[PDB]
């Protein structure tokens, strides 16, 4: 698994995949959950984004399997994706964290 996550074509695809998850996963009310959580994260000036695993098991579940089987690599990618998502949502959050 780790050899697969670190293969750079796969890694770029994984980055787009988790970014798509944080953008387009919704509550059944249609709200993007991770939109709201990123909004809250910046309002709290927090370094941590709470991701629910079941939401990833519900959409693009291969990423959830990778996250279970190979978390050291996968969290490394998912952190960069989360930073990109919040920097998109809050420009210059790189100055805060």
């Amino acid at each position: 698994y780790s050899e697969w996550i670190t293969q750079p074509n796969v890694s770029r695809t994984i980055a787009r995949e988790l970014k798509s998850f944080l953008l387009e996963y919704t509550d059944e009310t249609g709200r993007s959950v991770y939109g709201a959580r990123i909004r809250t994260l910046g309002e709290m000036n927090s370094e941590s984004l709470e991701v629910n695993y079941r939401h990833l098991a519900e959409s693009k579940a291969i990423l959830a399997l990778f996250l279970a089987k190979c978390p050291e690599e996968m969290l490394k990618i998912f952190d960069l994706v989360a930073m990109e998502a919040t920097e998109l949502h809050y420009p210059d959050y790189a100055r805060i964290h």
Partner: protein, 564 residues
């Protein structure tokens, strides 16, 4: 009319001719305390009469009762008075029981002259026409209003005075109509007294950076309530700053250099002494735009700093120690962000002063410090008199804070301003959370019955702080109709409410003709009908104090009256 803007010099020359000598003190300055603009005007005036070595007395006065007290105990040696910040809106000749034949001297010739001048330095309007035209002793300094506007009222006044038959009846009915349409206008302030005195100094040639700063301060005090007037006067202040600024460029900061600048002075509350966070938080305008009195508005403010890229810890640093890169960049950060929140009117160019190495102060911050000193710097009628004495005594703390030799007292003013605005904000969120405002058909009513800080709101200025905070919150909502407001607070010691009748105003960024305070004469009319024991001797006659039991009958008659 009496002394136009073009001829204040003649009035000042008359003051020196009549009331200057090495021999004797002859000039008395009555100044309304609890008025920053009157304070600054009196400071400029006192520096002028210091330089010209005129022996003179200043008496700070709370209201018309204290005026008529102090006037009654002036010796005949006193042949000039200056009434600063009051007296225009009332027939002083009748109120002080003047008889010109009791004051006339050396009439010879179709001519008159008098043993005491009474000059009036007041920016309140409408002028009482007996001061402007009726009296030969009362001498009002005019901004131009009388010559610009009151020709018809002048004509009506003089003809009705002369007009002691059907044509005669129709004419006196007509001119009664004119004068009773001129009276029953709502009250409004049209100028800064300090800029009026500055025009006098310009006519004498006495302008300097001290007097210009005092003019800026007295003028800046109008900005909360009378923004249109401040926008009239701001360009002239820019002209004078450029005229008096020295010629050196890229000047090295030096212990002796007083530099007075035009530069970005944001609409934030005590930015250079607050933290950045607190300067947003306790600003009237920011609270109005963000609806900051509730948790969702607080979340929005956090959202704002997060999108600015400013850490909340950095935002909460005391501004001196806050990150230098952020302070250099702050104008760019505001420009890039505040339109997204509708806070674009935070951007403003205002007057900043710095004196050597002891750090910058804006006119905004300085007037806040001065008001804080006026508010909190230091059998019922006796207790009320002792209270009003405390406010008279606060005047000299604001006065002394105007001097660079006593900047520790200005720092006391800054601290008291922060804690006052905290009390204002806490009482305000109490009002808006619990919905103390009642939406009566003609005006909004708010009455403070109980709670903390209630012993502050017996001061008229602190009550007006809460009123202005509420009114800024109302104005920035499109939901609310722009009704006038009544705001009241009980004094549990005197058993009297202090009641303030407050104008509405348009939202801060928009531009229209000013809207006038008609609570002044409305309170007078209810007072004239009623048996209630209400006092109306405060100089700002839209503020009264009334016994607790009388309030509900009074407000019932107020809302049944059509005057509002």
């Amino acid at each position: 009319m009496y002394y136009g803007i073009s001829q204040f010099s003649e009035a000042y020359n008359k003051i020196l001719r009549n009331s200057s000598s090495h021999s004797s003190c002859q000039l008395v300055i009555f100044v309304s305390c609890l008025n920053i603009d009157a304070l600054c005007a009196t400071k400029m005036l006192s520096l002028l009469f210091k330089k010209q070595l005129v022996q003179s007395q200043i008496v700070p006065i709370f209201g018309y009762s204290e005026l008529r007290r102090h006037y009654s105990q002036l010796d005949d040696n006193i042949n000039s008075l200056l009434l600063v910040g009051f007296g225009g809106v009332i027939d002083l000749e009748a109120f002080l029981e003047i008889d010109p034949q009791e004051y006339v001297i050396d009439t010879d010739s179709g001519e008159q002259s008098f043993r005491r001048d009474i000059y009036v330095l007041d920016a309140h309007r409408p002028w009482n026409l007996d001061n402007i035209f009726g009296s030969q002793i009362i001498q009002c300094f005019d901004d131009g209003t009388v010559d610009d506007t009151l020709g018809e009222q002048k004509e009506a006044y003089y003809k009705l005075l002369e007009l002691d038959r059907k044509q005669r009846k129709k004419q006196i009915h007509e001119y009664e109509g004119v004068l009773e349409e001129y009276y029953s206008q709502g009250t409004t302030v049209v100028n800064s007294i300090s800029a009026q005195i500055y025009s006098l100094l310009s006519a004498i040639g006495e302008t300097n950076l001290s007097n210009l700063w005092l003019n800026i301060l007295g003028t800046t005090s109008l900005d909360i309530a009378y923004a249109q007037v401040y926008n009239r006067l701001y360009p002239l202040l820019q002209d004078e700053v450029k005229r008096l600024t020295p010629s050196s460029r890229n000047s090295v900061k030096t212990p002796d250099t007083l530099t007075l600048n035009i530069q970005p002075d944001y609409y934030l509350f005590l930015l250079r002494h607050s933290s950045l966070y607190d300067s947003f938080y306790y600003s009237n305008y920011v609270n109005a735009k963000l609806s900051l009195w509730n948790e969702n508005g607080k979340k929005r403010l956090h959202k704002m700093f997060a999108r600015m890229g400013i850490p909340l810890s950095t935002a909460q640093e005391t501004w001196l120690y806050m990150d230098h890169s952020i302070k250099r960049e702050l104008g760019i950060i505001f420009d890039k962000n505040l339109d997204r929140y509708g806070l674009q009117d935070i951007i403003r160019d205002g007057f900043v002063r710095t004196l050597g190495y002891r750090g910058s102060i804006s006119a905004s911050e300085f007037v806040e410090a001065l008001t804080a000193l006026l508010e909190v710097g230091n059998n019922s009628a006796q207790k009320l008199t002792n209270l009003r004495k405390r406010w008279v005594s606060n005047f000299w703390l604001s006065w002394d804070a105007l001097d660079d030799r006593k900047v520790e007292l200005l720092n006391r003013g800054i601290q008291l301003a922060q804690d006052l605005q905290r009390a204002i904000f806490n009482t305000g969120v109490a009002i808006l959370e619990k919905k103390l405002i009642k939406h009566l058909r003609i005006y909004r009513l708010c009455v403070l019955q109980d709670g903390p800080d209630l012993d502050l709101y017996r001061n008229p200025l602190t009550l007006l702080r809460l009123g202005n905070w509420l009114i800024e919150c109302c104005a920035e909502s499109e939901d609310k109709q722009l009704l006038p407001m009544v705001l009241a607070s009980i004094d549990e010691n005197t058993d009297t409410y202090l009641v303030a009748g407050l104008t509405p105003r348009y939202p801060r960024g928009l531009d229209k003709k000013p809207i006038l305070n008609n609570f002044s004469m409305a309170f007078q009319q209810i007072t004239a009908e009623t048996d209630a024991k209400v006092r109306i001797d405060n100089f700002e006659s839209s503020i009264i104090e009334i016994r607790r039991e009388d309030l509900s009958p009074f407000l019932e008659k107020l809302t049944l009256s059509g005057l509002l």
